[PDB]
Design a binder for this molecule. Structure first.
Ligand SMILES: Cc1cc2nc3c(=O)[nH]c(=O)nc-3n(C[C@H](O)[C@H](O)[C@H](O)COP(=O)(O)OP(=O)(O)OC[C@H]3O[C@@H](n4cnc5c(N)ncnc54)[C@H](O)[C@@H]3O)c2cc1C
Ligand SMILES: Nc1ncnc2c1ncn2[C@@H]1O[C@H](COP(=O)(O)O)[C@@H](O)[C@H]1O
Lengths: 315, 251
């Protein structure tokens, strides 16, 4: 059998989720003799052969299509042709913004199994069994794929461990199917900064703060504590704090932080992406069912305004 | 000019919910229903286009769901949607994102809109699949995770910005009509807190086209997993705050 992994790159750099999928694939395959095939797609993708010539890769396919970076029409056509060529039992995509632009289009056309944002996967006997979340991550939903010869999964980032070491895949080159894409990529853009929240001590505010006039008391709490003030997405979407202070998947990963104090933040997957590595996490939230409590070291089920005022008094 | 916005009424769970006796879903008694958070933004974006245009723009919201979904659709009309369409038959129970994609497409073929907007994902199941499935069945141009849209009614191209990991955006020029999945923050919905009924027969589908049997995954069970547990600090505000300060210093 073969497992097909689609790598991901952007702005000349390989995204590290690629190596996570290679670990996942190697953990998943049923026998030592099964092969892991990795594809990298892009008009300049030969550049990535060194970075993808790693432990666990049996075959590496460079697909040259019409665009440098991701294009949904090019990726759908290319991945379709790879599945045809390699007959994989399982195809692993990252559950990434790029994959959102085509994975479910690729699955709609076909007789394939499909599930997204998967964080457990195994074979039981010959049966592939995948688990994903339900009801805002309050349950696990365990699924299988009856009678499907090919299953496409998108895989949650930061769950599967990459393998260590070099490898020696058979490298090949193919052209993408000649598809004129219905979109064209234009500039990358960084939107219109004082601090870089690759800092040590963070107090982070979420939607629980209620109204923009409540931001100031937290900025004063962080001031006096010696913390940097960050936020979850709704605060920055509202313009209440700059996008530069946003923690999470489409904000920053707070790589240097040792103490992160999350106030009125539910702990969405996307927020956790930015901060779940922090050694000491304190959550202050009036909802005991909040996901944030599943990663916090310390939990306080209390009103954030009452804690903030007391905290400022005691300091 | 017509913009069609697919909307979902999502379910959130009350505290102390339980799994059904068959183990395939949560007990319905613990569900609270409301419009998906992404759909506030998608609807507001359609309404911004209507407002900017000196020409006429019909904004139609469409949802596939049972009669509870009327509550959410009526609220969409009250906020300025021109028309609201609900599609359902009992045989559609358990239809996954790809099947919902198929049903929405049958409606869109009859409506023949100029753009289709869907949310990036649902707050309940977070498939992040439905809108791009519709694109596939329509064979239309598409882009996911749209944070900005520059579009005039009847143009044959639009410029979008898609939101990437880390904060960067990518400008993309896309052929129109297109399906776009719309991201949080693209705008600020201004109203922050009859319905046309369509059957499967009306859109040329049958029982064998829809439902759990036609879905791309089969649910084996749903269950409440063992998750990480925090050290809960009990006591008064003063001690909870004292606890925090003792933590801050040891650091
Ligand atoms: C592709 C994509 C990218 C995303 N990127 C990011 C990202 O980079 N960063 C990010 O943060 N999110 C991101 N999200 C958005 C994410 O899905 C959530 O919408 C967001 O994280 C929720 O923010 P929140 O926890 O502040 O609000 P909510 O989920 O509304 O939680 C507010 C919390 O405040 C609590 N609360 C209310 N009042 C009080 C009180 N008086 N005292 C104590 N607690 C109180 C509530 O109990 C609740 O738990 C992304 C989503 C998508 C799909
Ligand atoms: N039952 C439904 N009726 C109409 N639109 C839906 C339905 N389910 C999902 N959607 C659309 O898809 C988005 C949610 O994404 P997903 O996570 O893929 O279901 C919603 O915001 C809607 O635009």
């Amino acid at each position: 059998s073969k497992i097909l992994v689609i790598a991901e790159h952007r702005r000349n750099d390989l995204r590290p989720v690629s190596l996570e999928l290679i670990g996942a694939a190697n953990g998943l395959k049923k026998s030592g003799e099964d092969k892991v095939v990795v594809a990298v797609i892009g008009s300049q993708a030969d550049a990535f052969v060194p970075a993808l010539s790693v432990n666990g890769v049996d075959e590496l396919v460079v697909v040259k299509g019409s665009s440098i970076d991701f294009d949904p029409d090019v990726f759908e056509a290319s991945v379709s042709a790879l599945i045809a060529a390699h007959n994989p039992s399982v195809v692993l995509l990252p559950h990434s913004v790029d994959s959102l632009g085509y994975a479910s289009s690729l699955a709609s056309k076909t007789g394939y199994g499909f599930a997204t944002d998967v964080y457990i996967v195994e074979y039981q006997g010959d049966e592939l069994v995948a688990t994903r979340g339900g009801y805002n991550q309050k349950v696990n939903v365990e699924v299988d794929f009856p009678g499907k010869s090919t299953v496409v999964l998108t895989i949650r980032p930061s769950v599967f461990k990459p393998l260590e070491g070099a490898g020696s895949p058979v490298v090949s080159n193919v052209d993408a199917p000649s598809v004129q894409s219905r979109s064209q990529n234009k500039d990358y853009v960084e939107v219109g900064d004082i601090d870089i929240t690759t800092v040590d001590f963070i107090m982070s505010i979420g939607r629980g703060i209620g109204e923009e006039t409540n931001v100031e008391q937290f900025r004063e709490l962080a001031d006096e504590a010696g913390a940097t003030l960050c936020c979850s997405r709704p605060i920055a979407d509202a313009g209440w704090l700059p996008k530069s202070r946003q923690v999470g998947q489409s904000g920053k990963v707070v790589g240097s932080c040792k103490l992160y104090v999350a106030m009125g933040i539910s702990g969405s997957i996307q927020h956790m992406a930015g901060m779940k590595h922090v050694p000491t996490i304190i959550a202050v939230n009036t909802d005991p069912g909040a996901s944030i409590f599943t990663i916090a070291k310390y939990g306080i089920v209390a009103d954030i305004f009452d804690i903030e005022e007391e905290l400022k008094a005691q300091l | 000019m017509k913009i069609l916005v697919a909307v979902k009424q999502t379910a959130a769970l009350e505290e102390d919910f339980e799994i059904r006796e068959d183990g395939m879903d949560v007990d319905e008694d613990f569900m609270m229903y409301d419009l998906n958070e992404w759909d506030d933004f998608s609807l507001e974006e359609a309404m911004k286009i209507k407002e900017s245009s000196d020409t006429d723009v019909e904004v139609v919201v469409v949802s596939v769901g049972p009669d509870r979904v009327d509550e959410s659709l009526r609220k969409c009309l009250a906020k300025g949607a021109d028309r609201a369409v609900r599609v359902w038959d009992d045989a559609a129970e358990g239809s996954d994102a790809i099947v919902v994609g198929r049903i929405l497409t049958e409606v869109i073929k009859k409506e023949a809109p100029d753009m289709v907007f869907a949310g990036v994902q649902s707050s309940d199941q977070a498939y992040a699949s439905t809108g791009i499935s519709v694109a596939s069945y329509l064979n239309w141009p598409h882009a996911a995770v749209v944070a900005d849209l520059q579009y005039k009614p009847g143009d044959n191209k639009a410029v979008i910005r898609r939101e990437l990991e880390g904060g960067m955006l990518q400008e993309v020029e896309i052929n129109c009509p297109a399906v776009l999945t719309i991201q949080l923050g693209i705008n600020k919905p201004r109203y922050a807190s009859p319905i046309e009924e369509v059957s499967l027969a009306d859109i040329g589908l049958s029982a064998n086209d829809v439902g759990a049997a036609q879905s791309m995954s089969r649910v084996r069970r749903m269950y409440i997993p063992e998750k990480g547990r925090a050290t809960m600090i009990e006591g008064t505000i003063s001690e909870q705050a004292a606890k925090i300060i003792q933590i801050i210093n040891e650091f």
